[PDB]
Structure formats: C-alpha cells, structure tokens
Amino acid sequence: MASSKKVFEFKDDLNGSGKVLFSWSQDCSYIAVCGQSKVVYVLDKRGRKLKETVLKSKNKVIGLEWDKDQEFLAILQENSTCFLLWNVFQNSFEQQDLEEKSKGSFIKWSKTHPVLVIGTEKGILYFYNKKTQKKIPTMGKHSKKITTGDWNDEGLLITGSEEKVLTVSSHNSDSKGESITVQHEPSNLQWARQKTDDRDSSQRTITAILSNKSILMYDLNTKKQPLELVYEPKYGKIVDYQLFGDGYIVTGFTEGYVAHVSSHLYELRDEIQSKRIFQSSLDALCTNDIIYKLAVAGENQIHIYNLGTWEEVKSQRIELPKAAGNVTKMQWANNGQLLVVATANGHLYGYLTSIPFLTSTYGSIVSVLSSFTEVSIVDTSRINQIQNVSSINLETEPGFLSLGLYHLAAGINNNVWYYLWLDQKRNGIIKGGEMIQKRDYLGSVKDIRLNEFWAAVLTDGKC
C-alpha cells in the first residue's frame, strides 16, 4: 500500500494567503498556480518551477485557465479593465482589452475549441477567437453581473447571472436556448451525461446550484423544465457537488454530511444514500472516475471514499497542516495520477495517489514498474507463488516497456534504454541492469519489440 506521498509543498512565500487558483494542463503534465502574490508560476508534476511570471496589476486572479492547445494561460484579475494571455512556452504577454472599460468578472476557455468567453459586470459577453484573435460582442443576454460560467466537451458555453437566468451560447455565438426561467440564482455550472438506459445519448445535461441551497437540472432532449432538487435541512447550504460515473451526483454539505443520488429523473427526487463524514464543518469535495475515488476535504484532512459500496478509505487519508485553513480547491489530474491542493491560506500541496505502473510480459515472465525510480522483473514460472523480483535502476521514466528472454527495453519519447542479465549463455545468478547503449531517434518511439538476439523499434513512418 503506497501511501499518499507529499511530493511538493509550497507555502504563502510564493503563492499568497487566500483563495488560490491552480489549473491542470490538459495533458496532466504542467500545473499552473497563482494565489495572492500575483505570481503565476508553472511546476512540473513533481514540483519543479518551469515558467514564472508576475502580473502588472495587484488585483487577485479571479480566472486562470489553460487553453485547448495548452500553450496560453488566460488570466483575469479582480475587476480589471483587461485580461492577459501568457504564452508559457514562449513566456510572452498579450493584453486583451475589455470594451467600455468594463470590470472583468468571469473568463473561461472552451476546453475543446479555440473560443474564450469573457463576461463583465454589465452582462456583456465577449467571444475571443484565438485562430484570428478576434472579438465578437454579445449584449443583452444577461441584464446583471455574470456570476457563473462553464463549458462542455461540445464547447457550449453555459452562463448563469444574478437575474436567475441561464443562457447557452454556441461556437458561432448563436444562443442555444432562450432565457430560462429558474426558481432561484443558479451557480456552479457543470455539463453532465445524464443517466439513461439508451447508451447513444450525448453529454448535454446542465447541472447547477440554486442559491447555494438546492441543485438545478436542465435537459435538452424533451425541453423539460429545470428541476429543483431540494436537500434536507440537516444538510443546510451546499458546499459543493460533483458528477461521477454514468450520471450520478455526490454532494457535500456544511455539517460534514454527504449525499449520493442518481441523475436519472425517476430517481432524482429521493436521496439514494446519505453518509456522515465530519461533525464540525466541511471544506470541499472532488471526484475521479478513472481511479474511482472521492476526495472530501475537511478540518484540514482529506478523506478518500469509495463510490459503489461507499466504504471510507482510511488508508489514503491525508493529514493537512492546520495553518492551511479550510480547503478551498482540490483537483487530481484528468487521469488521476497526481492530486493538487489549494487552501484558504495560500498553501499548495501535491500528493501521489494512483500512478499506475506499466506491465509487459515475455514468456512466463512479467515486469512491474513499482516506484518510478526502478523497475522490478517478476517471475511467474511456478503456480500460486511468485519468485523473487529483481530490481533495475532507472533515471528516466519510460512510457513504453518491453521484455525479452534476457534483455529489458525501456522507451520514452525518442529515447531507448536497454538492460541485460549476466552475459547471454545461462542466467543462473541475475545481475543488475547495465546501460549497454543509449538510443535516440529523430521521431517518436511508437512501439518497441524484442525477441532475444534482435530488437525492433517503431517510429511514425519507419521501422
């Protein structure tokens, strides 16, 4: 059992005490962080600074987002008259103005298409096209300050304003749906694939939070009215809710209570499951469907939870420092390998949770990466028991692994490492891995194969 490893810890010395915004790259490689020190800096997955920058204004960052190509970071500050696109690789500034000297209130990039929406306090929505860097204004969609916004995989912008109005805009700036009359203020916009038996339904459901008290549901298929899912007074005001699996909702509340409901309309009205986690207060919660874990933060600790049987995973519980305060934001990678923590006092933490290890097999012999710094070869000759593993040291972490009768091949992008046991003949005593030859290629290593006396390397166009 590999416990949660605190790989990197950063304090308010470089982040700033307050509500910190951290953004994952879509390839789950580089992690951008900015809090109250106005410093936006990107770290590697293990916590090494790569590119650092400082904003011109002293306003707190209210919006930080990676673009679709993971090349530009969009940053909007507290009531700023402009916003900044920062090329991380080029480390280059470009400032986009807000028309009529409007105060910045919301920004969000289309996670699949090159469209960036900026909403101001006047209700005007500006659509920024990156391929031509052109602005399309839309006035009158919202009559008050825009409060919440989100994007879908299809790239449909959902925006909820103070006038209890939800509006959806497409890529061509076409409004998908008229002004929706909802009971109370919508917030925490999210796009969900609703639980339907027919498995040909696209992800189009809009799930939001009403007045920080209820959960609002909206669907497109049959033009059904938005539904106000009400929660018990013991729950109180909602802290947050997360969507997991094929359309299910898990929500946390102020008294350490958590509720699990199925997004199916026939089963949404009644709470399917309820559980008590904390007794004083709750900080936040987040889900990961690939690694199948629910992380609920409270009282400066992280509780890991199962979602099928809902067993409390005590093994992966994390004890956060007290000075961090109530946790404000929490997110894994898209694959769920590494988890990033931002709290109300500017603290930033990185923990190792899943990191699945690669396995490749030759005849009756398999390989297990185990820790990233080494690779253990595993013998499965006998039945019901496993022979002794043999550890081989590594410096670079490959994404491809291949096993032969004697050699072991470890391949990362355009780099190949080879290892051998003893020197041909009969193995007998097994020796440590030897760096026989470091191989480099002009192209990427698509696939690696190794019989015994020869080896084959694949590149995007040539073997």
Side-chain angles (χ1 to χ4, degrees):
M1 211 55 168
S3 58
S4 297
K5 179 184 176 180
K6 199 179 283 213
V7 185
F8 62 94
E9 165 188 8
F10 288 77
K11 305 179 181 176
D12 53 331
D13 60 335
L14 209 55
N15 290 319
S17 178
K19 186 179 289 293
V20 178
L21 290 182
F22 65 91
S23 199
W24 274 90
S25 64
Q26 197 155 2
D27 72 341
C28 78
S29 294
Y30 293 176
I31 299 167
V33 186
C34 179
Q36 284 61 236
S37 65
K38 96 190 79 169
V39 177
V40 176
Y41 64 95
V42 63
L43 310 163
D44 202 44
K45 58 177 160 184
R46 308 188 187 175
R48 314 176 181 84
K49 183 172 61 176
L50 310 175
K51 288 87 192 183
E52 186 185 344
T53 189
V54 176
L55 306 184
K56 297 183 179 178
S57 168
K58 286 198 171 184
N59 300 113
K60 301 189 298 294
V61 174
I62 66 171
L64 176 81
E65 181 138 7
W66 287 79
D67 66 327
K68 66 177 289 293
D69 309 311
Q70 315 167 40
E71 301 168 332
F72 299 89
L73 285 174
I75 307 172
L76 179 65
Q77 310 174 101
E78 283 281 336
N79 297 303
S80 188
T81 59
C82 304
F83 76 92
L84 308 171
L85 280 169
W86 165 41
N87 194 309
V88 177
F89 283 7
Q90 277 68 62
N91 208 41
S92 296
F93 277 167
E94 60 266 18
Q95 178 172 133
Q96 286 85 18
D97 292 331
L98 293 203
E99 295 178 1
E100 310 193 349
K101 300 182 180 178
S102 48
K103 313 98 182 172
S105 61
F106 153 75
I107 53 153
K108 222 151 188 167
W109 262 102
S110 173
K111 300 173 184 170
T112 47
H113 285 74
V115 177
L116 163 63
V117 159
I118 306 96
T120 71
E121 302 198 318
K122 305 173 181 173
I124 307 176
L125 289 161
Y126 302 94
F127 291 66
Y128 165 81
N129 206 324
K130 173 190 165 187
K131 66 187 75 66
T132 180
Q133 295 191 342
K134 284 191 177 183
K135 298 280 195 178
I136 292 178
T138 64
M139 291 56 68
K141 292 192 177 192
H142 288 303
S143 74
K144 287 195 182 182
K145 170 171 182 161
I146 180 64
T147 55
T148 176
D150 204 35
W151 290 90
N152 197 7
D153 291 337
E154 296 197 346
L156 301 174
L157 167 81
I158 176 61
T159 50
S161 58
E162 278 191 347
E163 56 166 19
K164 310 170 174 187
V165 166
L166 291 171
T167 60
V168 192
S169 304
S170 179
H171 299 288
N172 296 328
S173 296
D174 314 328
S175 303
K176 187 263 286 174
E178 64 275 339
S179 54
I180 309 165
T181 307
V182 302
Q183 276 148 295
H184 294 88
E185 178 180 334
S187 62
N188 198 13
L189 296 172
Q190 269 311 106
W191 287 90
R193 47 216 186 199
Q194 213 162 16
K195 198 261 186 174
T196 49
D197 209 340
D198 297 319
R199 297 194 171 184
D200 48 359
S201 70
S202 49
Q203 183 176 2
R204 293 291 271 279
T205 304
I206 297 161
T207 56
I209 279 175
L210 283 193
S211 175
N212 306 341
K213 276 186 175 184
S214 177
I215 288 189
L216 189 73
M217 183 278 288
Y218 181 79
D219 46 351
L220 282 167
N221 295 327
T222 57
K223 206 43 191 193
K224 280 174 182 177
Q225 294 182 351
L227 185 62
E228 179 186 351
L229 298 171
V230 186
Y231 286 93
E232 282 197 354
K234 82 174 197 202
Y235 288 155
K237 273 195 177 178
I238 189 171
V239 172
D240 206 17
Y241 84 105
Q242 306 272 358
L243 301 163
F244 86 91
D246 197 273
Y248 305 89
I249 302 170
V250 171
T251 179
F253 279 89
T254 178
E255 293 295 316
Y257 295 167
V258 64
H260 171 216
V261 194
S262 185
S263 67
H264 196 248
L265 184 60
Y266 179 76
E267 213 168 83
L268 269 174
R269 182 67 269 170
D270 291 323
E271 49 185 1
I272 291 315
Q273 194 168 5
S274 289
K275 204 170 185 186
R276 204 185 220 187
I277 307 187
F278 280 99
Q279 311 307 135
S280 67
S281 186
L282 200 54
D283 302 353
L285 73 164
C286 62
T287 46
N288 205 279
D289 291 331
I290 307 190
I291 75 169
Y292 179 41
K293 298 179 182 68
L294 172 65
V296 189
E299 289 161 16
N300 311 104
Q301 294 88 20
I302 298 177
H303 276 113
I304 310 296
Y305 269 82
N306 189 302
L307 281 166
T309 305
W310 269 80
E311 181 188 0
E312 187 190 347
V313 184
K314 189 43 185 72
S315 61
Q316 309 195 346
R317 185 176 183 269
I318 300 169
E319 213 284 331
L320 307 164
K322 179 63 68 179
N326 289 16
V327 176
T328 54
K329 193 177 179 186
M330 185 64 72
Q331 182 187 348
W332 288 279
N334 56 2
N335 191 28
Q337 293 179 356
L338 272 161
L339 165 67
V340 181
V341 181
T343 70
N345 270 337
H347 297 242
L348 180 89
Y349 303 110
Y351 301 98
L352 176 145
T353 298
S354 181
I355 303 281
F357 56 88
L358 198 45
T359 290
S360 197
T361 175
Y362 204 63
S364 278
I365 311 297
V366 301
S367 55
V368 163
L369 193 141
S370 294
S371 293
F372 35 86
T373 190
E374 60 93 23
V375 166
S376 313
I377 193 66
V378 186
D379 294 331
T380 67
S381 310
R382 85 164 80 88
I383 313 301
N384 298 334
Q385 284 89 21
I386 295 296
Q387 281 95 15
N388 50 358
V389 291
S390 180
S391 168
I392 310 292
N393 191 242
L394 277 81
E395 282 82 1
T396 65
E397 281 58 53
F400 319 105
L401 189 57
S402 175
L403 179 55
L405 180 72
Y406 286 108
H407 330 292
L408 181 68
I412 198 64
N413 194 354
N414 71 47
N415 309 120
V416 175
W417 296 31
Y418 290 136
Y419 297 103
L420 197 152
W421 299 348
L422 198 72
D423 199 50
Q424 206 61 73
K425 52 185 171 290
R426 81 287 185 276
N427 267 321
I429 59 170
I430 49 181
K431 302 285 102 175
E434 304 174 353
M435 202 45 238
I436 298 171
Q437 55 175 346
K438 173 69 173 66
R439 187 63 263 167
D440 309 277
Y441 288 97
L442 73 164
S444 295
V445 180
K446 203 193 89 61
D447 176 64
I448 192 66
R449 221 65 60 91
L450 163 75
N451 51 80
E452 164 55 36
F453 197 74
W454 296 63
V457 185
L458 283 81
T459 63
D460 291 331
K462 181 65 173 66
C463 177

mmCIF file of all heavy atoms in Angstrom, residues 155-193:
data_model
loop_
_atom_site.group_PDB
_atom_site.id
_atom_site.type_symbol
_atom_site.label_atom_id
_atom_site.label_comp_id
_atom_site.label_asym_id
_atom_site.label_seq_id
_atom_site.Cartn_x
_atom_site.Cartn_y
_atom_site.Cartn_z
ATOM 1 N N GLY A 155 -18.246 22.149 -26.336
ATOM 2 C CA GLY A 155 -17.906 23.556 -26.366
ATOM 3 C C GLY A 155 -19.078 24.504 -26.296
ATOM 4 O O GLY A 155 -19.017 25.589 -26.881
ATOM 5 N N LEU A 156 -20.152 24.126 -25.610
ATOM 6 C CA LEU A 156 -21.299 25.006 -25.427
ATOM 7 C C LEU A 156 -21.148 25.779 -24.124
ATOM 8 O O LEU A 156 -21.049 25.183 -23.046
ATOM 9 C CB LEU A 156 -22.601 24.206 -25.428
ATOM 10 C CG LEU A 156 -22.873 23.391 -26.694
ATOM 11 C CD1 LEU A 156 -24.115 22.535 -26.524
ATOM 12 C CD2 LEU A 156 -23.007 24.305 -27.902
ATOM 13 N N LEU A 157 -21.131 27.105 -24.229
ATOM 14 C CA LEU A 157 -20.951 27.969 -23.068
ATOM 15 C C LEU A 157 -22.266 28.115 -22.316
ATOM 16 O O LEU A 157 -23.257 28.581 -22.884
ATOM 17 C CB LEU A 157 -20.449 29.342 -23.504
ATOM 18 C CG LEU A 157 -20.522 30.404 -22.406
ATOM 19 C CD1 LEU A 157 -19.340 30.301 -21.445
ATOM 20 C CD2 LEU A 157 -20.658 31.799 -22.995
ATOM 21 N N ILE A 158 -22.274 27.740 -21.039
ATOM 22 C CA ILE A 158 -23.412 27.975 -20.159
ATOM 23 C C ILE A 158 -23.044 29.096 -19.198
ATOM 24 O O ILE A 158 -21.943 29.101 -18.631
ATOM 25 C CB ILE A 158 -23.816 26.694 -19.405
ATOM 26 C CG1 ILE A 158 -24.948 26.981 -18.413
ATOM 27 C CG2 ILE A 158 -22.623 26.083 -18.690
ATOM 28 C CD1 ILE A 158 -26.219 27.485 -19.048
ATOM 29 N N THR A 159 -23.945 30.067 -19.042
ATOM 30 C CA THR A 159 -23.706 31.215 -18.176
ATOM 31 C C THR A 159 -24.943 31.489 -17.337
ATOM 32 O O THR A 159 -26.053 31.577 -17.870
ATOM 33 C CB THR A 159 -23.342 32.463 -18.991
ATOM 34 O OG1 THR A 159 -24.302 32.652 -20.039
ATOM 35 C CG2 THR A 159 -21.950 32.331 -19.591
ATOM 36 N N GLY A 160 -24.745 31.635 -16.030
ATOM 37 C CA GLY A 160 -25.818 31.962 -15.113
ATOM 38 C C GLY A 160 -25.586 33.279 -14.403
ATOM 39 O O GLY A 160 -24.507 33.511 -13.841
ATOM 40 N N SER A 161 -26.599 34.143 -14.416
ATOM 41 C CA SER A 161 -26.467 35.508 -13.917
ATOM 42 C C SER A 161 -27.312 35.710 -12.661
ATOM 43 O O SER A 161 -28.046 34.821 -12.222
ATOM 44 C CB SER A 161 -26.852 36.519 -15.000
ATOM 45 O OG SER A 161 -28.178 36.303 -15.447
ATOM 46 N N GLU A 162 -27.197 36.911 -12.082
ATOM 47 C CA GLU A 162 -27.908 37.261 -10.856
ATOM 48 C C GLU A 162 -29.413 37.379 -11.046
ATOM 49 O O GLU A 162 -30.149 37.286 -10.059
ATOM 50 C CB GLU A 162 -27.372 38.579 -10.289
ATOM 51 C CG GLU A 162 -26.101 38.443 -9.475
ATOM 52 C CD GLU A 162 -25.758 39.707 -8.711
ATOM 53 O OE1 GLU A 162 -26.361 40.761 -9.003
ATOM 54 O OE2 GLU A 162 -24.886 39.646 -7.819
ATOM 55 N N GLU A 163 -29.885 37.582 -12.273
ATOM 56 C CA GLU A 163 -31.311 37.690 -12.544
ATOM 57 C C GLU A 163 -31.985 36.330 -12.675
ATOM 58 O O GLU A 163 -33.073 36.246 -13.255
ATOM 59 C CB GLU A 163 -31.548 38.520 -13.809
ATOM 60 C CG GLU A 163 -30.838 37.995 -15.045
ATOM 61 C CD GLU A 163 -31.356 38.621 -16.325
ATOM 62 O OE1 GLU A 163 -31.993 39.691 -16.250
ATOM 63 O OE2 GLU A 163 -31.120 38.045 -17.409
ATOM 64 N N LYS A 164 -31.362 35.274 -12.147
ATOM 65 C CA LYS A 164 -31.886 33.910 -12.217
ATOM 66 C C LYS A 164 -32.140 33.505 -13.670
ATOM 67 O O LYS A 164 -33.220 33.041 -14.041
ATOM 68 C CB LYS A 164 -33.152 33.768 -11.365
ATOM 69 C CG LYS A 164 -33.002 34.295 -9.947
ATOM 70 C CD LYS A 164 -34.340 34.357 -9.229
ATOM 71 C CE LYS A 164 -34.162 34.738 -7.767
ATOM 72 N NZ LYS A 164 -35.436 34.631 -7.004
ATOM 73 N N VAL A 165 -31.116 33.707 -14.495
ATOM 74 C CA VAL A 165 -31.197 33.423 -15.924
ATOM 75 C C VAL A 165 -29.974 32.616 -16.339
ATOM 76 O O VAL A 165 -28.836 32.975 -16.010
ATOM 77 C CB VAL A 165 -31.314 34.713 -16.759
ATOM 78 C CG1 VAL A 165 -31.046 34.426 -18.227
ATOM 79 C CG2 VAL A 165 -32.697 35.321 -16.587
ATOM 80 N N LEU A 166 -30.223 31.519 -17.054
ATOM 81 C CA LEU A 166 -29.199 30.683 -17.665
ATOM 82 C C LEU A 166 -29.284 30.824 -19.177
ATOM 83 O O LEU A 166 -30.359 30.651 -19.761
ATOM 84 C CB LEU A 166 -29.381 29.215 -17.270
ATOM 85 C CG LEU A 166 -29.117 28.810 -15.822
ATOM 86 C CD1 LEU A 166 -29.566 27.379 -15.581
ATOM 87 C CD2 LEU A 166 -27.644 28.954 -15.518
ATOM 88 N N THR A 167 -28.155 31.138 -19.807
ATOM 89 C CA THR A 167 -28.078 31.281 -21.255
ATOM 90 C C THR A 167 -26.936 30.433 -21.792
ATOM 91 O O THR A 167 -25.854 30.382 -21.198
ATOM 92 C CB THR A 167 -27.876 32.745 -21.673
ATOM 93 O OG1 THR A 167 -26.662 33.247 -21.100
ATOM 94 C CG2 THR A 167 -29.047 33.603 -21.216
ATOM 95 N N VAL A 168 -27.177 29.772 -22.921
ATOM 96 C CA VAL A 168 -26.178 28.930 -23.566
ATOM 97 C C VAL A 168 -25.859 29.513 -24.934
ATOM 98 O O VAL A 168 -26.762 29.845 -25.710
ATOM 99 C CB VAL A 168 -26.644 27.468 -23.698
ATOM 100 C CG1 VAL A 168 -25.471 26.585 -24.092
ATOM 101 C CG2 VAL A 168 -27.283 26.987 -22.408
ATOM 102 N N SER A 169 -24.568 29.632 -25.224
ATOM 103 C CA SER A 169 -24.076 30.151 -26.490
ATOM 104 C C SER A 169 -23.176 29.118 -27.154
ATOM 105 O O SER A 169 -22.374 28.457 -26.485
ATOM 106 C CB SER A 169 -23.312 31.462 -26.292
ATOM 107 O OG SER A 169 -24.110 32.421 -25.622
ATOM 108 N N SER A 170 -23.315 28.984 -28.470
ATOM 109 C CA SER A 170 -22.544 28.022 -29.240
ATOM 110 C C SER A 170 -21.235 28.650 -29.719
ATOM 111 O O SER A 170 -20.870 29.765 -29.341
ATOM 112 C CB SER A 170 -23.367 27.502 -30.417
ATOM 113 O OG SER A 170 -22.622 26.581 -31.193
ATOM 114 N N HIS A 171 -20.514 27.911 -30.567
ATOM 115 C CA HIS A 171 -19.241 28.402 -31.085
ATOM 116 C C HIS A 171 -19.431 29.575 -32.037
ATOM 117 O O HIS A 171 -18.604 30.494 -32.060
ATOM 118 C CB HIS A 171 -18.490 27.270 -31.783
ATOM 119 C CG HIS A 171 -18.157 26.124 -30.881
ATOM 120 N ND1 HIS A 171 -17.190 26.205 -29.902
ATOM 121 C CD2 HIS A 171 -18.664 24.871 -30.806
ATOM 122 C CE1 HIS A 171 -17.117 25.052 -29.263
ATOM 123 N NE2 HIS A 171 -18.000 24.225 -29.792
ATOM 124 N N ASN A 172 -20.506 29.564 -32.826
ATOM 125 C CA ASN A 172 -20.809 30.640 -33.760
ATOM 126 C C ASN A 172 -21.531 31.809 -33.100
ATOM 127 O O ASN A 172 -22.184 32.589 -33.804
ATOM 128 C CB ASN A 172 -21.642 30.103 -34.927
ATOM 129 C CG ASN A 172 -20.893 29.078 -35.755
ATOM 130 O OD1 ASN A 172 -19.671 29.144 -35.891
ATOM 131 N ND2 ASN A 172 -21.625 28.121 -36.314
ATOM 132 N N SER A 173 -21.437 31.927 -31.775
ATOM 133 C CA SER A 173 -22.103 32.968 -30.992
ATOM 134 C C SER A 173 -23.622 32.879 -31.084
ATOM 135 O O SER A 173 -24.323 33.849 -30.779
ATOM 136 C CB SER A 173 -21.626 34.368 -31.399
ATOM 137 O OG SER A 173 -20.250 34.543 -31.111
ATOM 138 N N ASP A 174 -24.146 31.728 -31.501
ATOM 139 C CA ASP A 174 -25.586 31.523 -31.558
ATOM 140 C C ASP A 174 -26.098 31.064 -30.199
ATOM 141 O O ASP A 174 -25.535 30.146 -29.592
ATOM 142 C CB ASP A 174 -25.939 30.496 -32.633
ATOM 143 C CG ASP A 174 -25.208 30.742 -33.937
ATOM 144 O OD1 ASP A 174 -24.944 31.919 -34.259
ATOM 145 O OD2 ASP A 174 -24.899 29.757 -34.641
ATOM 146 N N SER A 175 -27.162 31.703 -29.724
ATOM 147 C CA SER A 175 -27.725 31.361 -28.424
ATOM 148 C C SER A 175 -28.511 30.060 -28.524
ATOM 149 O O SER A 175 -29.538 29.998 -29.208
ATOM 150 C CB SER A 175 -28.620 32.493 -27.924
ATOM 151 O OG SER A 175 -27.908 33.716 -27.857
ATOM 152 N N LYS A 176 -28.030 29.023 -27.843
ATOM 153 C CA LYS A 176 -28.720 27.734 -27.797
ATOM 154 C C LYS A 176 -29.711 27.790 -26.642
ATOM 155 O O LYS A 176 -29.361 27.586 -25.479
ATOM 156 C CB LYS A 176 -27.724 26.589 -27.651
ATOM 157 C CG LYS A 176 -28.338 25.195 -27.764
ATOM 158 C CD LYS A 176 -28.636 24.613 -26.393
ATOM 159 C CE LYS A 176 -27.358 24.177 -25.702
ATOM 160 N NZ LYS A 176 -27.591 23.722 -24.303
ATOM 161 N N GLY A 177 -30.958 28.079 -26.968
ATOM 162 C CA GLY A 177 -31.991 28.225 -25.965
ATOM 163 C C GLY A 177 -32.204 29.675 -25.578
ATOM 164 O O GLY A 177 -31.276 30.492 -25.566
ATOM 165 N N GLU A 178 -33.450 30.006 -25.252
ATOM 166 C CA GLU A 178 -33.811 31.363 -24.864
ATOM 167 C C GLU A 178 -33.512 31.562 -23.379
ATOM 168 O O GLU A 178 -32.865 30.734 -22.732
ATOM 169 C CB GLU A 178 -35.276 31.634 -25.196
ATOM 170 C CG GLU A 178 -36.263 30.769 -24.425
ATOM 171 C CD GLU A 178 -36.490 29.419 -25.076
ATOM 172 O OE1 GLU A 178 -36.214 29.286 -26.287
ATOM 173 O OE2 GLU A 178 -36.944 28.489 -24.375
ATOM 174 N N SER A 179 -33.978 32.678 -22.823
ATOM 175 C CA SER A 179 -33.804 32.935 -21.400
ATOM 176 C C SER A 179 -34.620 31.937 -20.589
ATOM 177 O O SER A 179 -35.843 31.858 -20.734
ATOM 178 C CB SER A 179 -34.220 34.366 -21.068
ATOM 179 O OG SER A 179 -35.537 34.632 -21.519
ATOM 180 N N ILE A 180 -33.941 31.178 -19.736
ATOM 181 C CA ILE A 180 -34.577 30.126 -18.954
ATOM 182 C C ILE A 180 -35.041 30.705 -17.626
ATOM 183 O O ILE A 180 -34.256 31.322 -16.897
ATOM 184 C CB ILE A 180 -33.615 28.945 -18.736
ATOM 185 C CG1 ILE A 180 -33.006 28.502 -20.068
ATOM 186 C CG2 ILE A 180 -34.337 27.788 -18.067
ATOM 187 C CD1 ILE A 180 -31.795 27.607 -19.917
ATOM 188 N N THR A 181 -36.319 30.505 -17.311
ATOM 189 C CA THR A 181 -36.897 30.979 -16.059
ATOM 190 C C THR A 181 -36.659 29.924 -14.986
ATOM 191 O O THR A 181 -37.294 28.865 -14.992
ATOM 192 C CB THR A 181 -38.388 31.265 -16.224
ATOM 193 O OG1 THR A 181 -38.588 32.153 -17.331
ATOM 194 C CG2 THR A 181 -38.952 31.902 -14.961
ATOM 195 N N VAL A 182 -35.745 30.213 -14.065
ATOM 196 C CA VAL A 182 -35.414 29.298 -12.984
ATOM 197 C C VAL A 182 -35.864 29.912 -11.665
ATOM 198 O O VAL A 182 -36.066 31.125 -11.543
ATOM 199 C CB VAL A 182 -33.910 28.955 -12.954
ATOM 200 C CG1 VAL A 182 -33.484 28.353 -14.284
ATOM 201 C CG2 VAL A 182 -33.091 30.189 -12.644
ATOM 202 N N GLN A 183 -36.031 29.046 -10.663
ATOM 203 C CA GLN A 183 -36.640 29.469 -9.405
ATOM 204 C C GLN A 183 -35.745 30.434 -8.634
ATOM 205 O O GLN A 183 -36.229 31.434 -8.091
ATOM 206 C CB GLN A 183 -36.980 28.244 -8.558
ATOM 207 C CG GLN A 183 -38.313 27.608 -8.924
ATOM 208 C CD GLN A 183 -38.327 26.108 -8.709
ATOM 209 O OE1 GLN A 183 -37.598 25.367 -9.369
ATOM 210 N NE2 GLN A 183 -39.157 25.651 -7.779
ATOM 211 N N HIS A 184 -34.443 30.161 -8.573
ATOM 212 C CA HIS A 184 -33.528 30.992 -7.801
ATOM 213 C C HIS A 184 -32.209 31.119 -8.551
ATOM 214 O O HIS A 184 -32.075 30.676 -9.695
ATOM 215 C CB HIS A 184 -33.323 30.426 -6.392
ATOM 216 C CG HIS A 184 -34.556 30.456 -5.543
ATOM 217 N ND1 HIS A 184 -35.474 29.428 -5.526
ATOM 218 C CD2 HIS A 184 -35.025 31.393 -4.686
ATOM 219 C CE1 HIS A 184 -36.454 29.730 -4.693
ATOM 220 N NE2 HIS A 184 -36.205 30.917 -4.170
ATOM 221 N N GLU A 185 -31.226 31.732 -7.891
ATOM 222 C CA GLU A 185 -29.937 32.040 -8.500
ATOM 223 C C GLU A 185 -29.165 30.770 -8.836
ATOM 224 O O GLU A 185 -28.877 29.963 -7.944
ATOM 225 C CB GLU A 185 -29.107 32.925 -7.568
ATOM 226 C CG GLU A 185 -27.725 33.264 -8.103
ATOM 227 C CD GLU A 185 -26.934 34.142 -7.154
ATOM 228 O OE1 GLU A 185 -27.557 34.873 -6.356
ATOM 229 O OE2 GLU A 185 -25.686 34.098 -7.203
ATOM 230 N N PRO A 186 -28.804 30.566 -10.101
ATOM 231 C CA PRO A 186 -28.007 29.389 -10.461
ATOM 232 C C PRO A 186 -26.519 29.642 -10.272
ATOM 233 O O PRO A 186 -26.028 30.759 -10.448
ATOM 234 C CB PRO A 186 -28.351 29.176 -11.940
ATOM 235 C CG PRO A 186 -28.655 30.554 -12.443
ATOM 236 C CD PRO A 186 -29.205 31.352 -11.282
ATOM 237 N N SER A 187 -25.799 28.582 -9.908
ATOM 238 C CA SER A 187 -24.363 28.669 -9.683
ATOM 239 C C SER A 187 -23.746 27.290 -9.866
ATOM 240 O O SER A 187 -24.444 26.275 -9.914
ATOM 241 C CB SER A 187 -24.047 29.231 -8.293
ATOM 242 O OG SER A 187 -24.549 28.384 -7.274
ATOM 243 N N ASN A 188 -22.418 27.269 -9.973
ATOM 244 C CA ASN A 188 -21.638 26.042 -10.133
ATOM 245 C C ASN A 188 -22.114 25.244 -11.348
ATOM 246 O O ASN A 188 -22.592 24.113 -11.245
ATOM 247 C CB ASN A 188 -21.687 25.191 -8.860
ATOM 248 C CG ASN A 188 -20.580 24.156 -8.809
ATOM 249 O OD1 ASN A 188 -19.627 24.211 -9.586
ATOM 250 N ND2 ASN A 188 -20.701 23.205 -7.890
ATOM 251 N N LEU A 189 -21.974 25.867 -12.514
ATOM 252 C CA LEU A 189 -22.411 25.244 -13.755
ATOM 253 C C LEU A 189 -21.521 24.058 -14.111
ATOM 254 O O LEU A 189 -20.296 24.115 -13.983
ATOM 255 C CB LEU A 189 -22.400 26.270 -14.885
ATOM 256 C CG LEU A 189 -23.389 27.418 -14.688
ATOM 257 C CD1 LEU A 189 -23.193 28.489 -15.739
ATOM 258 C CD2 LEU A 189 -24.809 26.887 -14.722
ATOM 259 N N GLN A 190 -22.155 22.976 -14.562
ATOM 260 C CA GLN A 190 -21.448 21.765 -14.947
ATOM 261 C C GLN A 190 -22.221 21.073 -16.059
ATOM 262 O O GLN A 190 -23.449 21.176 -16.140
ATOM 263 C CB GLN A 190 -21.268 20.813 -13.757
ATOM 264 C CG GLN A 190 -19.974 21.009 -12.982
ATOM 265 C CD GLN A 190 -18.757 21.078 -13.883
ATOM 266 O OE1 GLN A 190 -18.188 22.148 -14.098
ATOM 267 N NE2 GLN A 190 -18.350 19.931 -14.416
ATOM 268 N N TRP A 191 -21.489 20.365 -16.914
ATOM 269 C CA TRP A 191 -22.068 19.597 -18.006
ATOM 270 C C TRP A 191 -21.962 18.115 -17.682
ATOM 271 O O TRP A 191 -20.890 17.631 -17.303
ATOM 272 C CB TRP A 191 -21.368 19.908 -19.330
ATOM 273 C CG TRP A 191 -21.708 21.258 -19.880
ATOM 274 C CD1 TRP A 191 -21.051 22.427 -19.639
ATOM 275 C CD2 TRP A 191 -22.788 21.580 -20.765
ATOM 276 N NE1 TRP A 191 -21.650 23.457 -20.321
ATOM 277 C CE2 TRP A 191 -22.720 22.965 -21.019
ATOM 278 C CE3 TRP A 191 -23.805 20.833 -21.369
ATOM 279 C CZ2 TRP A 191 -23.629 23.618 -21.849
ATOM 280 C CZ3 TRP A 191 -24.706 21.484 -22.194
ATOM 281 C CH2 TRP A 191 -24.612 22.862 -22.424
ATOM 282 N N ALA A 192 -23.074 17.400 -17.831
ATOM 283 C CA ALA A 192 -23.172 16.008 -17.422
ATOM 284 C C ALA A 192 -23.823 15.172 -18.512
ATOM 285 O O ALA A 192 -24.643 15.661 -19.296
ATOM 286 C CB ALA A 192 -23.980 15.860 -16.128
ATOM 287 N N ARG A 193 -23.439 13.898 -18.543
ATOM 288 C CA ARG A 193 -24.115 12.881 -19.344
ATOM 289 C C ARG A 193 -25.159 12.224 -18.446
ATOM 290 O O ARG A 193 -24.825 11.440 -17.554
ATOM 291 C CB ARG A 193 -23.108 11.878 -19.900
ATOM 292 C CG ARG A 193 -22.098 11.366 -18.876
ATOM 293 C CD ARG A 193 -20.722 11.155 -19.485
ATOM 294 N NE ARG A 193 -19.803 10.540 -18.535
ATOM 295 C CZ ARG A 193 -18.482 10.559 -18.646
ATOM 296 N NH1 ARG A 193 -17.883 11.159 -19.663
ATOM 297 N NH2 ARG A 193 -17.743 9.965 -17.714
#
